[PDB]
Amino acid sequence: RRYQKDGFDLDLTYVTERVIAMSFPSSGKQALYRNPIREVVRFLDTKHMDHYKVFNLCSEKGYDPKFFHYRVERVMIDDHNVPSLDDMLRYTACVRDWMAADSRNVIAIHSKGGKGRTGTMVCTWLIDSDVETPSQSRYVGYYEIMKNQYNRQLPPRKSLKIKSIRIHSIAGVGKGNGSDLKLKIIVKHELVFQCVCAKQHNCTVFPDTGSNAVVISLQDGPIVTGDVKVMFESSAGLPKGYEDCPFYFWFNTSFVENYRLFLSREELDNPHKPKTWDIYKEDFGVTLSFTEP
Amino acid sequence: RRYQKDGFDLDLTYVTERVIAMSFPSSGKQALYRNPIREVVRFLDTKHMDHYKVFNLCSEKGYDPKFFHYRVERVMIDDHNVPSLDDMLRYTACVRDWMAADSRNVIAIHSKGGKGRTGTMVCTWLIDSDVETPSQSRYVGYYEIMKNQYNRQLPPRKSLKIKSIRIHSIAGVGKGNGSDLKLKIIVKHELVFQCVCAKQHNCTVFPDTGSNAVVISLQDGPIVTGDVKVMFESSAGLPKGYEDCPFYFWFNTSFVENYRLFLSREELDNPHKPKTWDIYKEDFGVTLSFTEP
Protein backbone atom coordinates (compact mmCIF):
# COMPACT_ATOMS: atom_id res chain seq x y z
CA ARG A 1 0.00 0.00 0.00
CA ARG A 2 2.05 2.91 -1.31
CA TYR A 3 1.54 6.35 0.23
CA GLN A 4 0.16 8.28 -2.73
CA LYS A 5 -1.27 11.21 -0.75
CA ASP A 6 -0.12 14.83 -1.16
CA GLY A 7 1.93 14.20 -4.29
CA PHE A 8 4.08 11.43 -2.82
CA ASP A 9 5.04 8.15 -4.46
CA LEU A 10 7.02 6.49 -1.67
CA ASP A 11 6.69 2.85 -0.63
CA LEU A 12 5.48 3.82 2.84
CA THR A 13 3.12 1.85 5.08
CA TYR A 14 1.52 4.00 7.79
CA VAL A 15 0.98 0.99 10.05
CA THR A 16 -0.16 3.04 13.06
CA GLU A 17 -0.77 6.75 13.55
CA ARG A 18 2.49 6.88 15.52
CA VAL A 19 4.41 4.04 13.77
CA ILE A 20 5.44 4.26 10.11
CA ALA A 21 6.82 1.45 7.95
CA MET A 22 8.60 1.91 4.64
CA SER A 23 11.35 0.49 2.44
CA PHE A 24 15.01 1.41 2.28
CA PRO A 25 15.53 5.04 1.20
CA SER A 26 18.22 4.72 -1.46
CA SER A 27 20.49 7.25 -3.14
CA GLY A 28 22.17 7.48 -6.52
CA LYS A 29 21.02 5.51 -9.56
CA GLN A 30 18.50 3.56 -7.48
CA ALA A 31 15.59 5.97 -6.93
CA LEU A 32 13.88 4.85 -10.15
CA TYR A 33 12.08 1.84 -8.64
CA ARG A 34 12.96 2.29 -4.94
CA ASN A 35 12.48 5.11 -2.46
CA PRO A 36 14.66 8.21 -2.94
CA ILE A 37 16.38 9.16 0.30
CA ARG A 38 15.81 12.90 -0.11
CA GLU A 39 12.15 12.53 -1.13
CA VAL A 40 11.23 10.39 1.87
CA VAL A 41 13.30 12.69 4.11
CA ARG A 42 11.17 15.59 2.87
CA PHE A 43 7.99 13.55 3.32
CA LEU A 44 8.62 12.79 6.98
CA ASP A 45 10.00 16.28 7.59
CA THR A 46 6.87 18.07 6.37
CA LYS A 47 4.63 15.71 8.39
CA HIS A 48 6.51 15.41 11.72
CA MET A 49 9.19 18.05 12.22
CA ASP A 50 11.90 16.99 14.72
CA HIS A 51 9.54 14.25 15.93
CA TYR A 52 10.64 11.09 14.15
CA LYS A 53 13.32 8.43 14.54
CA VAL A 54 14.30 6.28 11.56
CA PHE A 55 15.06 2.68 12.49
CA ASN A 56 17.33 1.15 9.85
CA LEU A 57 16.98 -2.59 10.50
CA CYS A 58 19.62 -3.47 7.91
CA SER A 59 22.80 -5.38 8.68
CA GLU A 60 23.90 -4.89 5.07
CA LYS A 61 23.06 -1.31 4.05
CA GLY A 62 23.18 2.12 5.65
CA TYR A 63 23.15 5.64 4.30
CA ASP A 64 24.08 8.37 6.82
CA PRO A 65 22.76 9.61 10.18
CA LYS A 66 22.80 13.17 8.81
CA PHE A 67 19.93 12.67 6.34
CA PHE A 68 17.34 12.18 9.09
CA HIS A 69 18.72 15.00 11.27
CA TYR A 70 20.98 12.55 13.12
CA ARG A 71 18.04 10.51 14.46
CA VAL A 72 18.78 7.04 13.08
CA GLU A 73 19.29 3.75 14.94
CA ARG A 74 20.63 0.68 13.16
CA VAL A 75 19.50 -2.77 14.28
CA MET A 76 21.78 -5.47 12.87
CA ILE A 77 19.16 -7.80 11.40
CA ASP A 78 20.16 -10.11 8.56
CA ASP A 79 17.73 -10.52 5.68
CA HIS A 80 15.19 -13.29 6.32
CA ASN A 81 16.80 -13.67 9.75
CA VAL A 82 15.75 -12.69 13.26
CA PRO A 83 17.34 -10.24 15.72
CA SER A 84 18.77 -11.22 19.06
CA LEU A 85 16.36 -10.85 21.97
CA ASP A 86 18.80 -8.31 23.40
CA ASP A 87 18.41 -6.41 20.13
CA MET A 88 14.61 -6.65 20.40
CA LEU A 89 14.65 -5.49 24.02
CA ARG A 90 16.96 -2.56 23.24
CA TYR A 91 14.76 -1.73 20.24
CA THR A 92 11.59 -1.57 22.31
CA ALA A 93 13.43 0.30 25.07
CA CYS A 94 14.60 3.08 22.76
CA VAL A 95 11.17 3.18 21.12
CA ARG A 96 9.45 3.56 24.49
CA ASP A 97 11.91 6.29 25.49
CA TRP A 98 11.28 8.03 22.16
CA MET A 99 7.51 7.90 22.63
CA ALA A 100 8.01 9.24 26.17
CA ALA A 101 9.76 12.40 24.93
CA ASP A 102 6.41 13.87 23.88
CA SER A 103 3.04 12.71 22.59
CA ARG A 104 3.75 13.31 18.88
CA ASN A 105 6.93 11.30 18.32
CA VAL A 106 6.48 8.93 15.38
CA ILE A 107 8.84 6.18 14.26
CA ALA A 108 9.89 5.11 10.77
CA ILE A 109 10.96 1.49 10.28
CA HIS A 110 12.45 0.01 7.13
CA SER A 111 14.60 -2.74 5.67
CA LYS A 112 16.20 -3.20 2.27
CA GLY A 113 14.22 -6.26 1.20
CA GLY A 114 10.59 -7.17 1.81
CA LYS A 115 8.51 -6.46 4.90
CA GLY A 116 10.11 -9.32 6.78
CA ARG A 117 12.51 -7.46 9.05
CA THR A 118 10.38 -4.32 9.21
CA GLY A 119 7.31 -6.52 9.54
CA THR A 120 8.89 -8.47 12.39
CA MET A 121 10.03 -5.38 14.25
CA VAL A 122 6.77 -3.52 13.68
CA CYS A 123 4.70 -6.47 14.95
CA THR A 124 7.09 -6.78 17.91
CA TRP A 125 6.44 -3.16 18.83
CA LEU A 126 2.73 -3.62 18.15
CA ILE A 127 2.37 -6.44 20.65
CA ASP A 128 4.80 -4.86 23.13
CA SER A 129 2.62 -1.73 23.20
CA ASP A 130 -0.68 -3.65 23.28
CA VAL A 131 6.43 -11.28 8.81
CA GLU A 132 7.85 -13.56 6.11
CA THR A 133 9.58 -16.51 7.71
CA PRO A 134 8.39 -18.62 10.66
CA SER A 135 11.62 -17.87 12.53
CA GLN A 136 10.41 -14.27 12.75
CA SER A 137 7.00 -15.50 13.90
CA ARG A 138 8.55 -17.65 16.63
CA TYR A 139 10.74 -14.73 17.68
CA VAL A 140 7.66 -12.54 18.03
CA GLY A 141 6.37 -15.44 20.13
CA TYR A 142 9.53 -15.37 22.22
CA TYR A 143 9.12 -11.64 22.73
CA GLU A 144 5.48 -12.02 23.78
CA ILE A 145 6.43 -14.73 26.27
CA MET A 146 9.06 -12.34 27.62
CA LYS A 147 6.61 -9.43 27.67
CA ASN A 148 3.85 -11.23 29.57
CA GLN A 149 5.90 -13.60 31.77
CA TYR A 150 9.53 -12.45 32.23
CA ASN A 151 8.44 -8.84 32.19
CA ARG A 152 10.29 -6.95 29.41
CA GLN A 153 13.54 -8.65 30.42
CA LEU A 154 15.73 -11.59 29.45
CA PRO A 155 14.51 -15.08 30.35
CA PRO A 156 16.31 -17.10 33.03
CA ARG A 157 19.59 -17.70 31.24
CA LYS A 158 19.72 -21.36 30.22
CA SER A 159 22.89 -22.81 28.73
CA LEU A 160 21.87 -25.96 26.88
CA LYS A 161 23.92 -28.58 25.05
CA ILE A 162 22.47 -30.13 21.91
CA LYS A 163 23.01 -33.89 21.70
CA SER A 164 21.12 -35.16 18.65
CA ILE A 165 18.91 -34.00 15.79
CA ARG A 166 15.87 -36.04 14.75
CA ILE A 167 14.41 -35.65 11.26
CA HIS A 168 10.77 -36.70 10.88
CA SER A 169 9.36 -37.99 7.58
CA ILE A 170 12.56 -38.07 5.53
CA ALA A 171 11.09 -40.38 2.86
CA GLY A 172 11.21 -38.19 -0.24
CA VAL A 173 13.80 -35.60 0.76
CA GLY A 174 17.47 -36.31 0.18
CA LYS A 175 19.06 -39.26 -1.57
CA GLY A 176 16.82 -41.70 0.30
CA ASN A 177 18.94 -42.45 3.35
CA GLY A 178 19.21 -39.01 4.97
CA SER A 179 23.03 -39.00 4.82
CA ASP A 180 23.23 -35.79 2.80
CA LEU A 181 22.23 -33.01 5.22
CA LYS A 182 24.96 -30.59 6.30
CA LEU A 183 24.68 -28.99 9.74
CA LYS A 184 25.76 -25.47 10.63
CA ILE A 185 25.21 -24.02 14.12
CA ILE A 186 25.69 -20.24 14.29
CA VAL A 187 25.70 -18.24 17.53
CA LYS A 188 26.41 -14.50 17.28
CA HIS A 189 27.74 -14.68 13.71
CA GLU A 190 30.07 -17.52 14.71
CA LEU A 191 29.98 -21.05 13.28
CA VAL A 192 30.11 -23.07 16.50
CA PHE A 193 29.50 -26.50 14.94
CA GLN A 194 29.35 -28.07 11.49
CA CYS A 195 29.11 -31.66 10.30
CA VAL A 196 28.62 -33.64 7.09
CA CYS A 197 26.54 -36.82 7.12
CA ALA A 198 27.93 -38.44 3.95
CA LYS A 199 31.50 -38.57 5.29
CA GLN A 200 30.21 -39.30 8.82
CA HIS A 201 33.14 -37.75 10.69
CA ASN A 202 31.79 -35.05 13.03
CA CYS A 203 28.38 -36.75 13.31
CA THR A 204 26.95 -40.26 13.05
CA VAL A 205 23.78 -41.32 11.24
CA PHE A 206 21.34 -43.83 12.78
CA PRO A 207 18.45 -44.24 10.32
CA ASP A 208 15.36 -45.98 11.70
CA THR A 209 13.24 -46.80 8.67
CA GLY A 210 10.33 -47.88 10.87
CA SER A 211 9.43 -44.35 12.00
CA ASN A 212 11.09 -42.49 9.08
CA ALA A 213 13.61 -40.81 11.40
CA VAL A 214 17.27 -40.40 10.45
CA VAL A 215 18.28 -39.20 13.94
CA ILE A 216 21.92 -38.07 13.87
CA SER A 217 23.92 -38.51 17.07
CA LEU A 218 25.52 -35.09 17.53
CA GLN A 219 28.57 -35.82 19.64
CA ASP A 220 30.29 -33.13 21.77
CA GLY A 221 27.61 -30.61 20.81
CA PRO A 222 28.14 -26.95 21.65
CA ILE A 223 26.88 -25.43 24.88
CA VAL A 224 24.59 -22.99 23.09
CA THR A 225 23.42 -19.92 24.99
CA GLY A 226 21.00 -17.33 23.65
CA ASP A 227 19.93 -17.17 20.01
CA VAL A 228 20.98 -20.05 17.76
CA LYS A 229 20.79 -20.62 14.00
CA VAL A 230 20.78 -24.18 12.64
CA MET A 231 20.73 -24.42 8.85
CA PHE A 232 20.67 -27.68 6.90
CA GLU A 233 22.74 -27.61 3.71
CA SER A 234 22.31 -30.40 1.19
CA SER A 235 24.18 -31.78 -1.82
CA ALA A 236 21.26 -33.63 -3.45
CA GLY A 237 19.52 -30.69 -5.13
CA LEU A 238 17.09 -29.76 -2.37
CA PRO A 239 14.89 -26.74 -3.19
CA LYS A 240 17.07 -24.03 -1.67
CA GLY A 241 15.03 -20.96 -0.81
CA TYR A 242 15.81 -18.08 1.52
CA GLU A 243 19.52 -17.42 2.20
CA ASP A 244 20.38 -20.30 -0.17
CA CYS A 245 19.63 -23.19 2.18
CA PRO A 246 17.10 -26.06 2.17
CA PHE A 247 15.90 -25.07 5.65
CA TYR A 248 17.27 -23.20 8.67
CA PHE A 249 16.20 -22.58 12.27
CA TRP A 250 16.30 -19.62 14.62
CA PHE A 251 15.53 -20.03 18.31
CA ASN A 252 16.43 -18.86 21.80
CA THR A 253 17.73 -21.68 23.98
CA SER A 254 16.36 -19.94 27.10
CA PHE A 255 12.85 -20.82 25.86
CA VAL A 256 13.41 -24.56 25.35
CA GLU A 257 11.21 -26.60 27.69
CA ASN A 258 12.05 -30.11 28.94
CA TYR A 259 15.24 -30.11 26.81
CA ARG A 260 13.38 -30.90 23.58
CA LEU A 261 12.55 -28.81 20.50
CA PHE A 262 10.49 -30.18 17.60
CA LEU A 263 9.79 -27.93 14.61
CA SER A 264 6.85 -28.98 12.46
CA ARG A 265 6.92 -28.74 8.67
CA GLU A 266 5.32 -25.30 8.93
CA GLU A 267 7.99 -23.76 11.19
CA LEU A 268 11.02 -25.10 9.47
CA ASP A 269 12.15 -21.89 7.72
CA ASN A 270 11.84 -22.38 3.88
CA PRO A 271 9.59 -25.50 3.76
CA HIS A 272 6.82 -23.27 5.15
CA LYS A 273 6.30 -21.74 1.70
CA PRO A 274 3.44 -23.57 -0.09
CA LYS A 275 5.39 -23.81 -3.35
CA THR A 276 7.59 -26.60 -1.96
CA TRP A 277 4.88 -28.74 -0.34
CA ASP A 278 5.87 -31.84 -2.33
CA ILE A 279 9.31 -32.87 -0.98
CA TYR A 280 8.38 -32.04 2.62
CA LYS A 281 5.13 -33.81 3.49
CA GLU A 282 2.79 -32.56 6.22
CA ASP A 283 4.43 -34.72 8.90
CA PHE A 284 7.95 -33.50 8.06
CA GLY A 285 9.85 -31.98 10.95
CA VAL A 286 13.14 -31.73 12.80
CA THR A 287 13.49 -32.49 16.52
CA LEU A 288 16.37 -31.05 18.54
CA SER A 289 17.47 -32.97 21.65
CA PHE A 290 19.11 -30.93 24.40
CA THR A 291 21.25 -31.72 27.44
CA GLU A 292 21.95 -29.87 30.68
CA PRO A 293 25.73 -29.43 31.27
CA ARG B 1 49.45 -1.76 -5.58
CA ARG B 2 47.03 -4.38 -6.88
CA TYR B 3 47.80 -8.07 -6.37
CA GLN B 4 48.54 -9.41 -9.85
CA LYS B 5 50.23 -12.61 -8.63
CA ASP B 6 48.86 -16.13 -9.14
CA GLY B 7 46.43 -15.07 -11.85
CA PHE B 8 44.58 -12.66 -9.55
CA ASP B 9 43.47 -9.12 -10.36
CA LEU B 10 42.42 -8.05 -6.86
CA ASP B 11 42.90 -4.68 -5.17
CA LEU B 12 44.85 -6.14 -2.25
CA THR B 13 47.74 -4.63 -0.29
CA TYR B 14 49.85 -7.19 1.58
CA VAL B 15 50.84 -4.70 4.27
CA THR B 16 52.62 -7.26 6.46
CA GLU B 17 53.25 -11.00 6.31
CA ARG B 18 50.23 -11.42 8.59
CA VAL B 19 48.13 -8.28 7.90
CA ILE B 20 46.28 -7.65 4.62
CA ALA B 21 44.60 -4.50 3.34
CA MET B 22 42.18 -4.49 0.42
CA SER B 23 39.07 -2.78 -0.91
CA PHE B 24 35.45 -3.68 -0.27
CA PRO B 25 34.47 -7.06 -1.78
CA SER B 26 31.37 -6.20 -3.80
CA SER B 27 28.68 -8.40 -5.31
CA GLY B 28 26.14 -8.06 -8.10
CA LYS B 29 26.69 -5.57 -10.92
CA GLN B 30 29.79 -4.10 -9.28
CA ALA B 31 32.61 -6.63 -9.85
CA LEU B 32 33.51 -5.03 -13.19
CA TYR B 33 35.63 -2.36 -11.49
CA ARG B 34 35.58 -3.39 -7.80
CA ASN B 35 36.61 -6.53 -5.95
CA PRO B 36 34.44 -9.59 -6.67
CA ILE B 37 33.38 -11.17 -3.40
CA ARG B 38 33.71 -14.73 -4.68
CA GLU B 39 37.13 -14.07 -6.24
CA VAL B 40 38.62 -12.58 -3.07
CA VAL B 41 37.03 -15.38 -1.02
CA ARG B 42 38.76 -17.90 -3.29
CA PHE B 43 42.07 -16.03 -3.06
CA LEU B 44 42.17 -15.92 0.74
CA ASP B 45 40.83 -19.47 0.98
CA THR B 46 43.59 -20.99 -1.16
CA LYS B 47 46.21 -18.81 0.56
CA HIS B 48 45.06 -19.06 4.20
CA MET B 49 42.71 -22.01 4.71
CA ASP B 50 40.77 -21.61 7.98
CA HIS B 51 43.47 -19.27 9.35
CA TYR B 52 42.21 -15.75 8.62
CA LYS B 53 39.58 -13.30 9.83
CA VAL B 54 38.13 -10.57 7.62
CA PHE B 55 37.57 -7.17 9.23
CA ASN B 56 34.85 -5.07 7.56
CA LEU B 57 35.39 -1.44 8.55
CA CYS B 58 32.25 -0.13 6.83
CA SER B 59 29.39 1.49 8.71
CA GLU B 60 27.36 1.91 5.51
CA LYS B 61 27.48 -1.49 3.78
CA GLY B 62 28.03 -5.15 4.57
CA TYR B 63 27.57 -8.33 2.59
CA ASP B 64 27.18 -11.58 4.60
CA PRO B 65 29.19 -13.44 7.26
CA LYS B 66 28.80 -16.67 5.30
CA PHE B 67 31.17 -15.84 2.43
CA PHE B 68 34.29 -15.89 4.63
CA HIS B 69 33.15 -18.99 6.54
CA TYR B 70 31.63 -16.91 9.35
CA ARG B 71 34.96 -15.32 10.34
CA VAL B 72 34.07 -11.65 9.93
CA GLU B 73 33.90 -8.72 12.35
CA ARG B 74 32.37 -5.38 11.42
CA VAL B 75 33.82 -2.15 12.81
CA MET B 76 31.35 0.73 12.48
CA ILE B 77 33.55 3.46 11.01
CA ASP B 78 31.90 6.15 8.91
CA ASP B 79 33.57 7.18 5.66
CA HIS B 80 36.12 9.97 6.15
CA ASN B 81 35.65 9.51 9.89
CA VAL B 82 37.48 7.96 12.83
CA PRO B 83 36.56 4.93 14.97
CA SER B 84 35.76 5.31 18.63
CA LEU B 85 38.63 4.54 20.99
CA ASP B 86 36.51 1.80 22.54
CA ASP B 87 36.13 0.35 19.04
CA MET B 88 39.88 0.65 18.44
CA LEU B 89 40.68 -1.16 21.70
CA ARG B 90 38.12 -3.88 20.93
CA TYR B 91 39.55 -4.29 17.42
CA THR B 92 43.13 -4.46 18.70
CA ALA B 93 42.17 -7.00 21.37
CA CYS B 94 40.41 -9.05 18.69
CA VAL B 95 43.48 -8.96 16.43
CA ARG B 96 45.76 -9.89 19.33
CA ASP B 97 43.52 -12.83 20.25
CA TRP B 98 43.36 -13.94 16.62
CA MET B 99 47.14 -13.85 16.22
CA ALA B 100 47.50 -15.68 19.55
CA ALA B 101 45.18 -18.46 18.34
CA ASP B 102 47.78 -19.74 15.87
CA SER B 103 51.06 -18.70 14.27
CA ARG B 104 49.54 -18.71 10.75
CA ASN B 105 46.45 -16.59 11.45
CA VAL B 106 46.08 -13.58 9.15
CA ILE B 107 43.68 -10.63 9.08
CA ALA B 108 41.97 -9.03 6.08
CA ILE B 109 41.04 -5.36 6.34
CA HIS B 110 38.89 -3.33 3.96
CA SER B 111 36.65 -0.30 3.63
CA LYS B 112 34.23 0.79 0.92
CA GLY B 113 35.87 4.09 0.01
CA GLY B 114 39.58 4.87 -0.12
CA LYS B 115 42.28 3.56 2.18
CA GLY B 116 41.36 5.97 4.93
CA ARG B 117 39.62 3.68 7.39
CA THR B 118 41.56 0.56 6.41
CA GLY B 119 44.76 2.59 6.51
CA THR B 120 43.85 3.94 9.95
CA MET B 121 43.04 0.53 11.37
CA VAL B 122 46.10 -1.13 9.84
CA CYS B 123 48.47 1.56 11.14
CA THR B 124 46.84 1.15 14.55
CA TRP B 125 47.76 -2.53 14.54
CA LEU B 126 51.21 -1.70 13.15
CA ILE B 127 51.95 0.62 16.08
CA ASP B 128 50.28 -1.71 18.60
CA SER B 129 52.37 -4.73 17.60
CA ASP B 130 55.64 -2.80 17.19
CA VAL B 131 45.14 7.59 6.32
CA GLU B 132 43.07 10.12 4.38
CA THR B 133 41.94 12.75 6.85
CA PRO B 134 44.09 14.18 9.66
CA SER B 135 41.56 13.15 12.31
CA GLN B 136 42.44 9.54 11.52
CA SER B 137 46.08 10.50 12.08
CA ARG B 138 45.26 12.09 15.43
CA TYR B 139 43.34 8.97 16.44
CA VAL B 140 46.30 6.76 15.58
CA GLY B 141 48.23 9.15 17.82
CA TYR B 142 45.61 8.75 20.54
CA TYR B 143 46.02 4.98 20.31
CA GLU B 144 49.80 5.23 20.55
CA ILE B 145 49.43 7.42 23.65
CA MET B 146 47.03 4.88 25.17
CA LYS B 147 49.31 1.97 24.26
CA ASN B 148 52.49 3.45 25.73
CA GLN B 149 51.14 5.45 28.71
CA TYR B 150 47.69 4.27 29.90
CA ASN B 151 48.52 0.78 28.80
CA ARG B 152 46.07 -0.42 26.12
CA GLN B 153 43.15 1.03 28.11
CA LEU B 154 41.03 4.16 28.13
CA PRO B 155 42.56 7.36 29.56
CA PRO B 156 41.18 8.68 32.89
CA ARG B 157 37.60 9.44 31.94
CA LYS B 158 37.35 13.20 31.50
CA SER B 159 34.06 14.97 30.79
CA LEU B 160 34.33 18.62 29.75
CA LYS B 161 32.00 21.30 28.43
CA ILE B 162 32.95 23.47 25.46
CA LYS B 163 32.62 27.13 26.43
CA SER B 164 33.69 28.91 23.23
CA ILE B 165 35.22 28.23 19.82
CA ARG B 166 38.00 30.48 18.50
CA ILE B 167 38.59 30.82 14.75
CA HIS B 168 42.06 31.97 13.70
CA SER B 169 42.78 34.11 10.63
CA ILE B 170 39.27 34.60 9.23
CA ALA B 171 40.23 37.49 6.94
CA GLY B 172 39.31 35.95 3.59
CA VAL B 173 37.12 32.99 4.55
CA GLY B 174 33.39 33.53 4.84
CA LYS B 175 31.48 36.75 4.34
CA GLY B 176 34.27 38.73 6.03
CA ASN B 177 32.68 38.93 9.46
CA GLY B 178 32.45 35.27 10.50
CA SER B 179 28.66 35.25 10.92
CA ASP B 180 28.12 32.40 8.47
CA LEU B 181 29.52 29.34 10.27
CA LYS B 182 27.07 26.82 11.73
CA LEU B 183 28.08 24.37 14.45
CA LYS B 184 27.12 20.71 14.72
CA ILE B 185 28.41 18.58 17.60
CA ILE B 186 28.07 14.83 17.01
CA VAL B 187 28.75 12.39 19.86
CA LYS B 188 27.95 8.70 19.25
CA HIS B 189 25.80 9.51 16.19
CA GLU B 190 23.84 12.08 18.21
CA LEU B 191 23.51 15.77 17.33
CA VAL B 192 24.06 17.08 20.86
CA PHE B 193 24.49 20.75 19.91
CA GLN B 194 23.87 23.03 16.93
CA CYS B 195 24.01 26.77 16.35
CA VAL B 196 23.86 29.36 13.58
CA CYS B 197 26.08 32.44 13.76
CA ALA B 198 24.03 34.66 11.44
CA LYS B 199 20.89 34.45 13.59
CA GLN B 200 22.96 34.62 16.81
CA HIS B 201 20.51 32.65 18.94
CA ASN B 202 22.31 29.57 20.30
CA CYS B 203 25.72 31.29 20.16
CA THR B 204 27.02 34.85 20.11
CA VAL B 205 29.76 36.04 17.75
CA PHE B 206 32.51 38.36 19.03
CA PRO B 207 34.76 39.20 16.06
CA ASP B 208 38.14 40.40 17.34
CA THR B 209 39.52 41.96 14.16
CA GLY B 210 42.69 42.97 16.00
CA SER B 211 43.86 39.34 16.01
CA ASN B 212 41.67 38.05 13.14
CA ALA B 213 39.55 36.10 15.64
CA VAL B 214 35.77 35.59 15.71
CA VAL B 215 35.63 33.64 19.00
CA ILE B 216 32.00 32.58 19.50
CA SER B 217 30.60 32.34 23.02
CA LEU B 218 29.29 28.76 23.02
CA GLN B 219 26.79 29.26 25.82
CA ASP B 220 25.53 26.16 27.64
CA GLY B 221 27.76 23.82 25.66
CA PRO B 222 27.28 20.07 25.78
CA ILE B 223 28.93 18.03 28.50
CA VAL B 224 30.80 15.91 25.97
CA THR B 225 32.44 12.60 26.86
CA GLY B 226 34.54 10.24 24.77
CA ASP B 227 34.82 10.86 21.03
CA VAL B 228 33.43 14.13 19.65
CA LYS B 229 32.95 15.34 16.07
CA VAL B 230 32.58 19.06 15.34
CA MET B 231 31.52 20.11 11.84
CA PHE B 232 31.32 23.73 10.65
CA GLU B 233 28.42 24.42 8.28
CA SER B 234 28.45 27.60 6.21
CA SER B 235 26.20 29.38 3.71
CA ALA B 236 28.81 31.55 1.97
CA GLY B 237 30.03 29.08 -0.66
CA LEU B 238 32.92 27.51 1.22
CA PRO B 239 34.75 24.80 -0.76
CA LYS B 240 32.95 21.81 0.74
CA GLY B 241 35.11 18.70 0.58
CA TYR B 242 34.86 15.51 2.61
CA GLU B 243 31.44 14.77 4.12
CA ASP B 244 30.05 17.86 2.32
CA CYS B 245 31.19 20.40 4.92
CA PRO B 246 33.77 23.23 5.04
CA PHE B 247 35.67 21.57 7.89
CA TYR B 248 35.01 19.05 10.67
CA PHE B 249 36.95 17.59 13.61
CA TRP B 250 37.25 14.28 15.40
CA PHE B 251 38.75 14.49 18.88
CA ASN B 252 38.67 12.56 22.15
CA THR B 253 37.76 14.67 25.16
CA SER B 254 39.87 12.55 27.52
CA PHE B 255 43.10 13.61 25.76
CA VAL B 256 42.61 17.36 26.19
CA GLU B 257 45.48 18.93 28.15
CA ASN B 258 45.06 22.17 30.13
CA TYR B 259 41.41 22.41 29.01
CA ARG B 260 42.31 23.76 25.57
CA LEU B 261 42.46 22.27 22.07
CA PHE B 262 43.79 24.39 19.20
CA LEU B 263 43.51 22.81 15.75
CA SER B 264 46.07 24.08 13.26
CA ARG B 265 45.24 24.56 9.59
CA GLU B 266 46.90 21.24 8.74
CA GLU B 267 44.65 19.11 11.00
CA LEU B 268 41.32 20.75 10.44
CA ASP B 269 39.63 18.09 8.25
CA ASN B 270 39.27 19.48 4.64
CA PRO B 271 41.54 22.57 4.91
CA HIS B 272 44.34 19.99 5.11
CA LYS B 273 44.18 19.35 1.36
CA PRO B 274 46.60 21.70 -0.47
CA LYS B 275 44.09 22.42 -3.25
CA THR B 276 42.23 24.74 -0.84
CA TRP B 277 45.33 26.54 0.47
CA ASP B 278 43.99 29.91 -0.69
CA ILE B 279 40.96 30.65 1.52
CA TYR B 280 42.49 29.03 4.62
CA LYS B 281 45.89 30.65 5.10
CA GLU B 282 48.82 29.27 7.09
CA ASP B 283 47.60 30.81 10.37
CA PHE B 284 44.03 29.52 10.01
CA GLY B 285 42.91 27.35 12.90
CA VAL B 286 40.26 26.50 15.46
CA THR B 287 40.74 26.56 19.24
CA LEU B 288 38.47 24.49 21.50
CA SER B 289 37.90 26.04 24.92
CA PHE B 290 36.90 23.60 27.66
CA THR B 291 35.45 23.89 31.15
CA GLU B 292 35.41 21.31 33.93
CA PRO B 293 31.82 20.62 35.16
Author numbering:
A (entry chain A), B (entry chain B): 192 to 321, 349 to 511
Can you quote the paper on this entry?
Voltage-sensing phosphatases (VSPs) dephosphorylate phosphoinositide (PIP) signaling lipids in response to membrane depolarization. VSPs possess an S4-containing voltage sensor domain (VSD), resembling that of voltage-gated cation channels, and a lipid phosphatase domain (PD). To identify additional coupling determinants, we performed cryogenic electron microscopy (cryo-EM) on the Danio rerio VSP (Dr-VSP) and obtained two structures: a low-resolution monomer structure in a nanodisc and a high-resolution PD dimer structure.
Compared to Ci-VSP, Danio rerio VSP (Dr-VSP) with the active site cysteine mutated to serine (C302S) showed better protein expression and stability. We therefore incorporated Dr-VSP (C302S) into nanodiscs for the study with cryo-EM. This structure resembled prior X-ray crystal structures of the isolated Ci-VSP cytoplasmic domain15, with the E350 gate (E411 in Ci-VSP) occluding access to the active site. A similar, albeit smaller, interface is observed in Ci-VSP crystal structures. Cryo-EM on Dr-VSP yielded both a high-resolution dimer of the cytoplasmic domain and a low-resolution monomer structure in a nanodisc, which provide structural evidence that a full-length VSP can exist in both monomer and dimer forms.
